[PDB]
Amino acid sequence: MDDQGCPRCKTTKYRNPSLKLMVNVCGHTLCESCVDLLFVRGAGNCPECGTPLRKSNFRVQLFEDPTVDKEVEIRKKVLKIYNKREEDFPSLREYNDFLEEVEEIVFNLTNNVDLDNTKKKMEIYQKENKDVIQKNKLKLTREQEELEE
């Protein structure tokens, strides 16, 4: 809430900081009062960029850094892949190789074309979906619940 104001309507922030950033595929700061301005005309179009949005492409985020918003949001989807625990990796070198590869994919998606990344993800899907992906999904809730308690 320390930002000077919205690029277009920098008046609501000065009055109150209750407004929060809205994340979009544009990786593009937006504010609730300004969101209504987008709905009236275009209905899911960035004001200056004009990037189309399927249904408003809006979710609540509170990180003033635009690039990080995409990185964090992209990372959530990436976590769904290559989520196997370290114990599944016997070799010492491969422990972080997947993590290094996983982090590499994140950077490619943020800036590089995702066509190659999407194609690669399909290759892993055909193999990992059978056992490793399903196993960790079920176990995610178990570990999370125990850790919270």
């Binding site: 990180f63 003033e64 990185e71 964090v72 010492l92 972080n96 982090e103």
Partner: protein, 714 residues
């Protein structure tokens, strides 16, 4: 003056020793013979080091294999400088008795900022700036560039030190910091590094606590070489505060904003490097795969693998993500938040940051930072602080706590919140010292009862010995004045602080005492805000003007520059007949730093018990844990901290040479049995019940009588 101690014969330079000294040496020998860590108290500030040192010298000669080296630490470098003088005097006396040189070496370490010979760093005074310059001059790139002998300033002292200092070690001698600096100039070697090399073979090595407690720097210089060394601390009553402060790291909005800008510079630096130097510097990635210092101690420290973060572009985003989480988590406006283990979970879940990759971030930053050939680390110092905090939280939180203060005290609304990571137990950071070194002797003065320290610090002392100075003349004359001329309670209670009579009584006591007390006197309050209110009340009344007429009065402020000038003027007043009344705060840096000697602080005045603002959450977390673990009552420790601190500042008047000096406690609380018990033995035992509750005017009269007896010669 050789002393035939029961354990062995111990040489002693000075003419005579008091009976307490006999107990001191044998008590110390008992712990040394048992090879077990212990704690002891000796009143005299001077003569305690030589007595402590004297036994070690005899013990080393008797059992050289038992003890490798002596590690005698002191609180402040200005105070360690005088210590080595005592050792130098002892060595000459011992050497004179033998008649020939002996394989004994003694030196004192310190920061490059305090001692150095390089002209470029000489004008600079800030410690952080000195390291950046020295690091750049001694940087591997400069050293590698030095081989090319290209046109660029290369710090000659280190270059020739490596070729010379490595080959030839200094046989023996005593070199203070001032003397050590001169030796480097004539020999063209670093006063700092030369001392560092000498630690390999140096019978006596002395340096401040911050060179022996914080794992970032202490561990490297304090390597396992000291398998069995007699590590000793001096006046280490506030060891926990120094020990805890080493672990505690503070992250602020101003610091965070600096990190973001510094990170941007780091990002720009990488971009320049990528276009200029890629292949050669990329080799460090292979080194990272193959496998400023981390704050993790020996066992806690881990170096398995760098983790996911393996490249500058990847690692920088890692800090970017972590910085944002702290930025947002800090900007939150709410009550003070405590979340030792949950912050790691919250950070991990919020931005998908696993702890294990985050543990190596601080080490990776240094390794990555080195690859960047940066000009200096001073600019990026805040970023490392966050990195140090970043790795510390990810490492362990069992005995820690993340404290976030969206709103700071003394301010209705401030846009500069500070994220505290204050520790709660000092045993964690001091644990390696006890294990690495066979025995540690925590020698200190004005020590509140010994039994607490094993509770505060997880250790089993061999002995708990309290020593009271024994002299032909009773130098110290302590007293407590809880009742004034109005026979009204004078306790400086938080609810009673607003009382005008209590404020008036203190002015009356000081005014009356100033009349009888000769040149040189000091008054200690509880806090700066309370001090100003008391000063203002006296200023409005004629009490302050009367005090001004009786003697000059000096007040203390937060800024050191004002304190330094005022203190120098104070010392001038005592030298002349004017005399000076230096009002100070017990917990202020001035009190601990300054030492009061003959005709200086003749009548130390303790105005009210020294207590901190209980609303301070950081203290609450520390206080709460001690109640949760180690079984210490919340009030017991709080009183203990005040009693230990009240005795700390008031015990300087009796430094040594049996210079008469009285101590007056202006609070009825001290008269309570609990307060007296926590009082140091030497101060406590001299204090009697007859004078325990002296009236303000009655106390003045006895003080006048006391001066008369001390005034006459022996």
């Amino acid at each position: 003056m050789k002393l035939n101690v029961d354990g062995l014969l111990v040489y002693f330079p000075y003419d005579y020793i008091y009976p307490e000294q006999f107990s001191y040496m044998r008590e110390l020998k008992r712990t040394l013979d048992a090879k077990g860590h212990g704690v002891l108290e000796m009143p005299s500030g001077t003569g305690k080091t030589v007595s402590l040192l004297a036994l070690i010298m005899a013990y080393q000669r008797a059992y050289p294999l038992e003890v490798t080296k002596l590690i005698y630490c002191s609180r402040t470098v200005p105070e360690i400088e005088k210590v080595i003088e005592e050792l130098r005097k002892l060595l000459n006396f011992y050497e004179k008795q033998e008649g020939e040189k002996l394989p004994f070496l003694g030196l004192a370490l310190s920061s490059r900022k305090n001692l150095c010979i390089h002209p470029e760093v000489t004008p600079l005074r800030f410690g952080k700036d000195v390291d950046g310059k020295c690091h750049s001059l001694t940087a591997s790139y400069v050293r590698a560039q030095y081989q090319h002998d290209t046109s660029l300033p290369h710090c000659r002292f280190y270059e020739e030190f490596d070729a010379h200092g490595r080959e030839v070690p200094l046989p023996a001698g005593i070199y203070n910091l001032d003397d050590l600096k001169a030796l480097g100039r004539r020999q063209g070697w670093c006063p700092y590094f030369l001392a560092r090399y000498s630690i390999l073979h140096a019978n006596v090595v002395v340096y401040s606590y911050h060179y022996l407690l914080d794992p970032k720097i202490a561990d490297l210089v304090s390597k396992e070489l000291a398998r069995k060394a007699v590590v000793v601390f001096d006046e280490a009553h506030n060891i926990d505060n120094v020990c805890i402060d080493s672990m505690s790291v503070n992250l602020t909005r101003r610091t965070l904003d600096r990190c973001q800008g510094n990170l941007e510079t780091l990002q720009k630096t990488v971009l320049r490097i990528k276009e200029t130097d890629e292949q050669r510097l990329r080799d460090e990635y292979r080194r990272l795969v193959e496998g400023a210092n981390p704050v993790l101690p020996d066992e806690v420290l881990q170096e398995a693998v760098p983790g996911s973060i393996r490249t500058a572009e990847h690692f920088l985003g890692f800090l970017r993500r972590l910085l944002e989480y702290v930025k947002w988590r800090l900007r939150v406006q709410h009550v003070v938040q405590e979340s030792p283990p949950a912050f790691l979970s919250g950070l991990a879940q919020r931005v998908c940051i696993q702890r294990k990759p985050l543990r190596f971030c601080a080490e990776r930053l240094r390794s990555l930072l080195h690859t960047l050939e940066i000009t200096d680390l001073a600019d990026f110092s805040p970023l490392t602080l966050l990195a140090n905090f970043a790795t510390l939280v990810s490492t362990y939180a069992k005995g820690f706590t993340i404290i976030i203060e969206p709103f700071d005290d003394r301010t209705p609304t401030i846009a500069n919140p500070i994220l505290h990571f204050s520790c709660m137990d000092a045993s964690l950071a001091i644990k390696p010292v006890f294990e690495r070194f066979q025995s540690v002797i925590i020698t200190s003065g004005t020590l509140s009862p010994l039994d607490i320290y094993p509770k505060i610090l997880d250790f089993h002392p061999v002995t708990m010995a309290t020593f009271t100075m024994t002299l032909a003349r009773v130098c110290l004359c302590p007293m407590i004045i809880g009742r004034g001329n109005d026979q009204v309670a004078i306790s400086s209670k938080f609810e009673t602080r607003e009382d005008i009579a209590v404020i008036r009584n203190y002015g009356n006591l000081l005014l009356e005492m100033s009349a009888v007390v000769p040149d040189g006197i000091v008054a200690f309050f509880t806090s700066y805000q309370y001090m100003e209110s008391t000063v203002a009340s006296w200023y409005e009344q004629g009490i302050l003007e009367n005090i001004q007429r009786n003697k000059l009065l000096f007040i203390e402020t937060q800024d050191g520059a004002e304190t330094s000038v005022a203190l120098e003027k104070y010392q001038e007043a005592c030298e002349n007949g004017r005399g000076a009344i230096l009002l100070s705060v017990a917990r202020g840096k001035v009190s601990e730093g300054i030492d009061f000697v003959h005709h200086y602080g003749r009548a130390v005045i303790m105005f009210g018990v020294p207590y901190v603002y209980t609303q301070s959450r950081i203290l609450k977390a520390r206080l709460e844990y001690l109640r949760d673990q180690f079984q210490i009552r919340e009030n017991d420790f709080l009183t203990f901290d005040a009693m230990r601190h009240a005795a700390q500042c008031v015990g300087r008047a009796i430094r040594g040479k049996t210079d008469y000096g009285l101590m007056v406690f202006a609070d009825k609380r001290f008269a309570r049995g609990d307060k007296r018990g926590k009082l140091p033995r030497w101060i406590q035992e001299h204090l009697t019940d007859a004078n325990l509750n002296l009236t303000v005017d009655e106390g003045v009269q006895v003080a006048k009588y006391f001066l008369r007896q001390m005034a006459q010669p022996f």
